[PDB]
Design a binder for this molecule. Structure first.
Ligand SMILES: *[C@@H]1O[C@H](CO)[C@@H](O[C@@H]2O[C@H](CO)[C@@H](O)[C@H](O)[C@H]2NC(C)=O)[C@H](O)[C@H]1NC(C)=O
Lengths: 48, 49
C-alpha cells in the first residue's frame, strides 16, 4: 500500500482428502518492509 | 548556494521536465528515455517533437 509492504500468516493441522478445508481460521501479521516499488507479478520457489 | 552553486553552474543537479502525466504521492520516476511530445512516436536517441 502506497509505499508499504506487509505479511500475515497462519498454520494448522487437518486430515481431509484433496482440498482446502471447511472451517474458519485467521492470520496474524509477521513482517513489514518499506520497499516502495511498483509490484505487478510474483513467483513461488520450491526445492527438490 | 554557499555549498552547491558553481561559477559555470552546478549541472550535477537535475529535474524532470516532460512526462505523460503527474506522478503518485511519494512516487518517484527514474527514467532517462526520450519523451514523445508530437503525435508521431519517437525512436532512437533524438528527433523532431
Ligand atoms: C508501474 O509499472 C506498470 C507497468 O510498467 C505501469 O503500468 C503501465 O503504464 C503504461 C502507461 O499508461 C501502459 O502503457 C502499460 O500498459 C501499463 N502496464 C501495466 C502492466 O499496467 C504503472 O503505471 C507503473 N506505476 C507507477 C506508479 O509508475
Amino acid at each position: 500500500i502506497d509505499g508499504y509492504f506487509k505479511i500475515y500468516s497462519k498454520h494448522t493441522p487437518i486430515n481431509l482428502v484433496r482440498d482446502l478445508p471447511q472451517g474458519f481460521s485467521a492470520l496474524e501479521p509477521l513482517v513489514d518492509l518499506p520497499i516502495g516499488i511498483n509490484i505487478t507479478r510474483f513467483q513461488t520457489l520450491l526445492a527438490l | 548556494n554557499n555549498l552547491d552553486s558553481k561559477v559555470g553552474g552546478n549541472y550535477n543537479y537535475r529535474y524532470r521536465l516532460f512526462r505523460k502525466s503527474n506522478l503518485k504521492p511519494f512516487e518517484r520516476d527514474i527514467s532517462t528515455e526520450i519523451y514523445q511530445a508530437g503525435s508521431k512516436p519517437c525512436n532512437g536517441v533524438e528527433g523532431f517533437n
